[PDB]
Subunit: 170 residues, 12 copies
């Protein structure tokens, strides 16, 4: 039913809408941005660049569901950071697992990465329990990592490995 | 009402409106400390500094999407954690009591998101109602700048007023 | 007269400028670079969009008819002085618009731009123009001998000036 | 089968190429530079428009339906050899079009381009494909051990070849 | 009635048509050209450049009448070469004098040049007699100057001076 | 008739037609000694060498404006006053007897306008009718180039044939 | 003091600039861009050779010892103002030079540049400097609160200013 | 021992940095971009000379001998954080400089650059070093599993941090 | 005095120009762009090397000591005029070189460059130079009020002029 | 023999590479671009300095005489393989250095670079080297027919390979 | 006297060319572009190094003394024409080199460059020189009236030419 | 002759190239662009360092005397052909070198380049050269009429050629 498509220029206005509400400073290849035109200029500059890969998610009706990002990709350590944003009008439909699995399948089969980690705000038990459900395990509890909404907040770092993902059924 | 108003990062399309605002005023207008007068100069300036992060600007519109004004932070220093705030309300929305709501919104962004230590601003000595307004919002005078700006025919004095992050967050 | 407004010049106004510089019988310049054709002028316009040495303002009226041009050149921010010229369209010349125009320019050059002296050149063989600028408050400071080749003959211009303090008081 | 034609690839064909490289489950390249998105591919396409290292040909039929792609890469003008691959659209696979396609490529690579050897890789775990290329006249020359990571598992490809003299005689 | 307008990009297709029939190799700032696109590229390159000035001629109906060119303009010697091309559908209407006079008036008043010369093919008595009519005088008969239509052809060089043009009535 | 045909310097718009011609042929096609296959390659080549004068090309159309063929001079040397001529007629106009008219037109341009001394051309040994054609137009063999060009599967011989300016003008 | 002279800064002078901006421990800036290494600075110098927002002058004595630096930054020719500052090389402080320099800076700014107003900032924790500029005609227009993070804490600084007519016409 | 000093890196220091990143048997990075040869580094140094995400100091002594390098990387001026690394030359290890240098980098980070958190990475397989950092005020916040491929295999590293509020209210 | 030469300026001479413009006590420009440092002036020199608006000539004796600068600016090739300025080294004033200098400049502008008018500004409050120029055939044509800010007060310059024919019919 | 070092290549070393590729008797490339002259190779060197496809290591003894070249090409970071080649100077062959060399390369590619497969071509008609590589753990996986034109005839190369685990479980 | 030789101009020859264009009291041109200072010329030389409309040879002797310059300009490869100029250094005038040099430039023009017409300009006010050229084969084709502004006034020049057909069938 | 070696041309070598293209009095060319001055050539060299349409080799002897030049131009890898020519420095002609060089050029072209056909032009007014190339396996395929303007008149030249299988397999 659900599909993942590599991101392209048409998709930017959708990206841009996503990067509002949850109200961090957003980034594109580590360069920060607030406005469409800013983003568009960043998009055009880093079109060649492989440190980050993005995939829009649409359904069988082409409703734009959410975004799967991979950043900080390193091909020596063979690792990457993953995050995911679902559009508010599509949360609570059970989609997030399917997507995480598709991110992991891509990273661990096509990109051939060794390790995917991610970050979840400690003041968000639900997500933690979700990534836990999907294979992730805590490797860190990072104290005062980010200033969000008025204060420095803690976040869990969580990770999964390739042989685990691919071979844990054998 | 005033929850009804919303901030929104500026966009190429917003330049006409900016230009209209900076006309009424009869000072020179700067964009990243660089002067301009015509829309073309501005568009050329906008594009040059589209990536620069010493200034950030928000368009203020309402629920019916009318264009209300501009919230502007310039001179952002990310070592000393400071910036200068300016606000501009369109003529036909002056005197409807939005200022204090917009001031509060800008303070919010500067302190809860951008994580700055100090916002300061300039007001004309010759406009005490505006000075008594900011004071009411928590601003305090730190300077009377003598003959600082050449405005509409002569040099004018301005109050430099500030507010610190610790005082806002604890309001 | 009160209807007249001033507006920073923009790209769209280049047609109007070009039509105005048609009859002059002299080589019109742009940031001291000569030009005949729109295309020449446009390319120039893009090149000097940020050059502060010159500043231009279009005059339009009630229902936005293009009346004329106000122009400052050789602007110098050390000595605080500019040369000034003004052109009104043929189809609006002789209505009483010149004065108002002159004024609005001075107002700009003295209340906004913070200049000390404004000078201009008028053809000697233009009697009434010289008397006009006198009425607005200019004074001859030079009678410039054989300064400009015009209609196939070197001619005399007067150079005329007015000061910030004399406008404002 | 006789209806099928070959056509140098052009910009307009980039959509067709992109759709074809969707399912592959591997990272498609362009002049050895990887790409996922149309926009990525387009920018690449502009960059290597004159690079001779690779050459591409779109297959279309009677009423210009896009059938598939023929592709030569690592073309070497000293040793006179290219690697070769072919992709047919899902909605035209299994019609008897492969053979014809293979041939037309060889014809090109040997009658026009003046190459000596054509090689290609087929997944070992693809029995019938290997038998196919044998029928057109390819011979294994290598069984390449754990060459490509595919579906999360390093896999074996056979490398298969055919020569100019063997096509032409 | 007749008017001269500085040349611009819209006018190129008209230029291009003119530079066919009379069948020399045509030039733009001394660079040669045969095709529209060639010309257009030359036009865009030498838009700044002042060695040459061109003026389309239109009537009170905006019919494109002909072209007045000035080339080899030198502001030390204060001289230029002039030529003129009328479109075949507008020859024999007595226009050529009016135009030559307008070229001379421009060159000698606005540009303030000292001397305008030109070339006419010796095997064209009519034009010679025309320029003669307009003030020009022969300063040279240049032997085998140009290869035209199969052979090297002679041309008269003819000139007029500024004080002559402007003051010969006083 | 054949006065009815006209030459015309090539233009960006003519590239589609050129591309269509150079398909039939199953040689590689060059544009300023640089190979191409797809329309995009050609457009990119065209624009690069739009100013180069080592080659000149004319489109041949008729009175009803149908596209007839291409007259092409390459390798123009302006010291030795020489060039190579090639001609290409669209399929559906081959065998209507235009060639000799077009050949004569190209010779005309080369010799009465471009002022060249020698036009030479290549013809396939394996096509004697074409060879007996050029001879009839005044061309003469100066060489049998052994295995010169790789064409449609093997190396072929070609006649190099020429004609000089003095012989044309005195025809 | 009779000996002292000013010279517009040039490339040779960069090593000296750099030696000055070390053991004072603000972050330093060229045209509002930060820098710590020589190379960093050099790159910035070249990038900003045209730029008229800031003018710098080296001070040398009659023996051509490099005495100190006079900077003007934030120069605006609409408001006709600028911000001044001065740095003397540690091995030359307490030799009475500072006043003479300040007069020269005010003289250039107000004659040759034809500026209207010159301001500067003094750390509040420097009473002696405050007094100095105060002697030279400068007056307090601001006590800027927690303006700068210097040495592990935020610090107050005085803004001080002098006007052109004051400077030129005070004795008239 | 106080004789030790820190000096903003200069092009001329690159050889020394290269000599340092020989031993390591990791891949070396300059601004998140990998290098091996001095020529790669020098070309990287020039590209990134203005970039502010990283900061490097060469440590020398009274006798101007080259002791070591102090790096800050991944500097973020919103979240006010940065990763720190130190390298001592082989022949200067075990002479008691590390704590002093650790303490100098902490000083710069918190007194001049006005950061809030400094963190670093240390091999799980080097408890000596983990206990060293702990004694200097660092606390463990993570056990990164198989984070870095280093000399033959994937290794775990402790991530340790320390906060500005704590370095300043220090013993 | 008869030995004084004039030589086109070049890069080598910049040090000299720089030293000369040192204590001018008003800002020096170069093609209307202001400068203070040698480095600034050098960049400027390279930028305007083919710019014709201005032309500069170094003066040397038969021993090749650097005597002065002759400088024409605001050169207009339509109206054939220029502004002229001259600077003599502090170590060569009061030797009666000026008029020879003034002359050689006139000579070049009127016999080589084909200009019609030369004009120049002289501080009103420097009456000696005023009379000097009068003595060479310059004549007041303007008393320019408050033209230049100099030494903290706007001052008056005379503008003074001579024609090509008055130079040559003498 | 234990003293042999390996050092990343740099500009200084190009002379050596150039000399080594001299009488190869087939064309030498650089990032897949062919070259003959030092000057050509230098330009090439600057063009691909940050290109990761290929990596090169110079071999020296404890006395720093230039011993050989170790070279990895066609490096793919997804599939984790490279082609390997090695050249020893004519004046250092027949000293038993190859295997030490071969090893150090393997060592780098498998323990630093994180690669999974190394492969290499050896002329069939050079059976000694064939067995040499066999002796270090390489194994035929292809007999490539008429791959390369060498000395006026297309010749056969074996392609031979080893894995990361067979190197390390030894 | 045959000892004299001609040598395609080199950057290093520029000083000498500059020394030559001092005396002249005309404005000097390099590729139809005027110059005065050596710095203008050197910058012009580099711009036009590939341009083929002009050609220059330095004349030296057996003892490698610099004698003179031979220039061909306005070269047209369709009409096969060019203007020629010569300059002899002051201290080498009236020693009988001119005719030899005239004859060497004629030789190059017609035997190597394959031109058809060489013309030149000479002052009407220098009959000595007009008679010199006439003796070398040149014939008058024009009396250009007030053509060049030279040292104070406008001057007439003879335009003289000579054809290739005539230099080759020469005595 | 046993001593002779070939080396791909580099920048140092340009002076030598230039000295060669003087007193032979064709117009000379680099990548089909004309040139007379050293500087001209140098500029062309740099412009065409990538270009593979032409390859040049310097000949040196065991003492490193610069003996001559071997050029290949018009190289095409579809038709696999190229045009060869050779120039020996006047002070080295009649030393028997020419053949050995021609073999080396044919060897590079037909082994390392894997070309199919090598042609050259000889002026018809040079019987001796014709004979030489003829000895080396070249055969006439054209008598190109008035091909080149050389020395004040248009001149005939022979086109000659040899094929790869000939070169390699003739003794087989």
């Amino acid at each position: 039913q659900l599909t993942l498509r590599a991101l392209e220029r048409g998709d930017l206005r959708f990206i841009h809408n996503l990067n509002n509400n949850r109200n961090i400073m957003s980034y594109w290849f580590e360069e920060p941005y607030e406005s469409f035109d800013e983003l568009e200029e960043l998009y055009n500059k880093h079109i060649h660049d492989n440190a980050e890969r993005r995939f829009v998610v649409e359904d069988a009706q082409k409703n734009l569901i959410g975004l799967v990002e991979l950043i900080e990709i390193n091909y020596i350590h063979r690792s990457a950071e993953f995050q995911i944003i679902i559009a508010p009008e599509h949360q609570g439909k059970g989609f997030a697992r399917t997507l995480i699995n598709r991110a992991l399948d891509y990273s661990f089969t096509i990109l051939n990465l060794h390790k995917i980690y991610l970050h979840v705000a400690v003041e968000n038990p639900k997500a933690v329990h979700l990534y836990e459900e999907c294979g992730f395990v805590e490797e860190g509890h990072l104290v005062e990592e980010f200033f969000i909404n008025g204060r420095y907040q803690d976040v869990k770092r969580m990770y999964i490995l390739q042989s685990k993902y691919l071979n844990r059924s054998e």
